[PDB]
Amino acid sequence: NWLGGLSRAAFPKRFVFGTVTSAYQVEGMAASGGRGPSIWDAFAHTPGNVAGNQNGDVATDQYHRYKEDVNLMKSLNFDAYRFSISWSRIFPDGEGRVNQEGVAYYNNLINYLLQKGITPYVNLYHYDLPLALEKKYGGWLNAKMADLFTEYADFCFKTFGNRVKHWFTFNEPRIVALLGYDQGTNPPKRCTKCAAGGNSATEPYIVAHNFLLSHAAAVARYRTKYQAAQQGKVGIVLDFNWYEALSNSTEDQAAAQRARDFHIGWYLDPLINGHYPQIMQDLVKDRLPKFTPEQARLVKGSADYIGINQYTASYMKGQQLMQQTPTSYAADWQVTYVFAKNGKPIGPQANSNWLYIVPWGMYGCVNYIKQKYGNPTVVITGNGMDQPANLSRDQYLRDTTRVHFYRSYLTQLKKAIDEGANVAGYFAWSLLDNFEWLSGYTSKFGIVYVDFNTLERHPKASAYWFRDMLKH
Ligand SMILES: OC[C@H]1O[C@@H](O[C@H]2[C@H](O)[C@@H](O)[C@H](O[C@H]3[C@H](O)[C@@H](O)[C@H](O[C@H]4[C@H](O)[C@@H](O)[C@H](O)O[C@@H]4CO)O[C@@H]3CO)O[C@@H]2CO)[C@H](O)[C@@H](O)[C@@H]1O
Ligand SMILES: OC[C@H]1O[C@@H](O[C@H]2[C@H](O)[C@@H](O)[C@H](O[C@H]3[C@H](O)[C@@H](O)[C@H](O[C@H]4[C@H](O)[C@@H](O)[C@H](O)O[C@@H]4CO)O[C@@H]3CO)O[C@@H]2CO)[C@H](O)[C@@H](O)[C@@H]1O
Numbered sequence: 001n002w003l004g005g006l007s008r009a010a011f012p013k014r015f016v017f018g019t020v021t022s023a024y025q026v027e028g029m030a031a032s033g034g035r036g037p038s039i040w041d042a043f044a045h046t047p048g049n050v051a052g053n054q055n056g057d058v059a060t061d062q063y064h065r066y067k068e069d070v071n072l073m074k075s076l077n078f079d080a081y082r083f084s085i086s087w088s089r090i091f092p093d094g095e096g097r098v099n100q101e102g103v104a105y106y107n108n109l110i111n112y113l114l115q116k117g118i119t120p121y122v123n124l125y126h127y128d129l130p131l132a133l134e135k136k137y138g139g140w141l142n143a144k145m146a147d148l149f150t151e152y153a154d155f156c157f158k159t160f161g162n163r164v165k166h167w168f169t170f171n172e173p174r175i176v177a178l179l180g181y182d183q184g185t186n187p188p189k190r191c192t193k194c195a196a197g198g199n200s201a202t203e204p205y206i207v208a209h210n211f212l213l214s215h216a217a218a219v220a221r222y223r224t225k226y227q228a229a230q231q232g233k234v235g236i237v238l239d240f241n242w243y244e245a246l247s248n249s250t251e252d253q254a255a256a257q258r259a260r261d262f263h264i265g266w267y268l269d270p271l272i273n274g275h276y277p278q279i280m281q282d283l284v285k286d287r288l289p290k291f292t293p294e295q296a297r298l299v300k301g302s303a304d305y306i307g308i309n310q311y312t313a314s315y316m317k318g319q320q321l322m323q324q325t326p327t328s329y330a331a332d333w334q335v336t337y338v339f340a341k342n343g344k345p346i347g348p349q350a351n352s353n354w355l356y357i358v359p360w361g362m363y364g365c366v367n368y369i370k371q372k373y374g375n376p377t378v379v380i381t382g383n384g385m386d387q388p389a390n391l392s393r394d395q396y397l398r399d400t401t402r403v404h405f406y407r408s409y410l411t412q413l414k415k416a417i418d419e420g421a422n423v424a425g426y427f428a429w430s431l432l433d434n435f436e437w438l439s440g441y442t443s444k445f446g447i448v449y450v451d452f453n454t455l456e457r458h459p460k461a462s463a464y465w466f467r468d469m470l471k472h
């Protein structure tokens with residue numbers, strides 16, 4: 001069967017199914033409704049930065065069409081919606097003055113979601129630092145971000161927390177560190193060779209450290225001031241792609257484990273165990289900031305659940321661990337990526353070159369977290385694949401590869417859950433084709449097609465797959 005035996009009966013009772021977007025990627029009204037610019041606004045408006053010089057000024061215009069989009073998600077039988085609040089839509093300068101029109105939008109969205117029986121899962125941050133804070137403070141390079149983010153979080157808890165019970169602080173801080181401060185391909189475009197300045201060997205670690213400290217501070221505020229009355233939860237969203245040893249050799253197995261530790265351990269070891277992974281301490285040394293005992297105790301246990309974005313997998317080949325001059329976070333791992341074993345590719349690629357379709361990577365990741373980290377509560381906060389640009393409407397709608405993707409990845413997730421993994425929910429990236437960062441509108445991740453000329457929504461076959469699989 002096209003469902004392949006999947007239904008709500010195949011998952012735990014009360015398991016949460018939803019779709020995911022982010023503010024800059026779907027809202028539009030980027031310079032309207034009182035919103036101040038984010039670092040992504042400035043970045044996207046610079047010629048050459050984004051495919052086709054496109055930007056999120058209009059995006060899917062969810063700002064105006066949110067009731068249509070909520071009706072759609074309900075008609076597809078989803079229980080929940082993961083979306084983000086744009087910081088600069090609330091505080092145009094990141095601090096100080098509140099933009100009441102911005103607040104009203106999120107009130108209206110949250111209220112409509114609840115009216116339709118869709119549970120809001122709200123990210124406070126999704127790559128969209130207020131430009132004003134970047135210029136004034138130096139963004140995530142500055143430890144003061146913990147205070148700034150906490151004040152912002154405090155406002156959101158006070159204003160929406162009587163209705164919102166499921167929060168996330170950050171989205172994929174690893175990607176911010178890697179692309180914004182190691183490679184310098186995403187804002188603020190910092191790296192060793194970069195025009196804006198930077199240092200690929202030190203800055204990614206400073207940035208990650210500040211995300212963890214900011215997360216911990218925001219959660220401490222929630223717990224001490226708001227939790228008693230509101231009785232909600234706050235997590236964090238981390239990307240984790242699977243790494244599989246190329247062979248059963250000691251060095252290949254060691255390499256796969258190093259990669260896991262530098263990828264997910266970087267954040268999970270602090271959040272669960274109150275310290276960075278031993279191998280990162282060993283290899284990165286004095287370039288890795290040290291938590292004080294107090295900070296480590298604040299960070300440890302500071303996530304009520306772990307959001308995991310899971311997409312893909314790769315083979316890892318090992319080598320002799322060497323004394324090296326430090327160059328970058330990426331080079332610190334001392335591993336070699338390989339995308340074939342025994343002459344066969346790990347899987348076919350979706351539109352994005354990094355996204356290899358490998359359903360067993362979902363099992364790999366979920367099982368690994370269960371076994372290593374004491375089976376913490378996990379929510380799959382993003383999973384999906386993209387079609388390329390320039391197809392016809394009907395070609396977008398017949399997304400048979402995506403249907404196969406969801407069936408296979410969810411079957412592998414089910415396998416992990418059945419083996420005892422504490423997974424509480426699953427969110428498909430994305431509800432809609434949207435602004436895909438550097439790819440602009442050339443990458444289509446949605447289960448619902450968006451005509452970017454007319455802004456019309458058209459459910460794809462995969463959307464109807466979800467509707468059928470999720471009927472109550
Ligand atoms: O309907 C609007 C819209 O739908 C789009 O998507 C279609 C798919 O294209 C089509 O393949 C899919 O057909 C499903 C059907 O909905 C299921 O009910 C059926 O399930 C069977 C199953 O195959 C058996 O093995 C199992 O034991 O029993 C059930 C009995 O129902 O499986 C088929 C797939 O083979 O339906 C989607 C939704 O309608 C269309 O693309 C678009 O043109 C339509 O406008
Ligand atoms: O993208 C869809 C959706 O998902 C969420 O985030 C995505 C990012 O958008 C995407 O940029 C990021 O891509 C990673 C990829 O996961 C890694 O496998 C890849 O690894 C590199 C490695 O860094 C290099 O050193 C090596 O040489 O090559 C490998 C293979 O290319 O690095 C890329 C970075 O370009 O993956 C995220 C999830 O994994 C977001 O939540 C959402 O906003 C996005 O729209």
Ligand SMILES: [Zn+2]
Pocket residue numbers: 061064
């Ligand atoms: Zn509009």
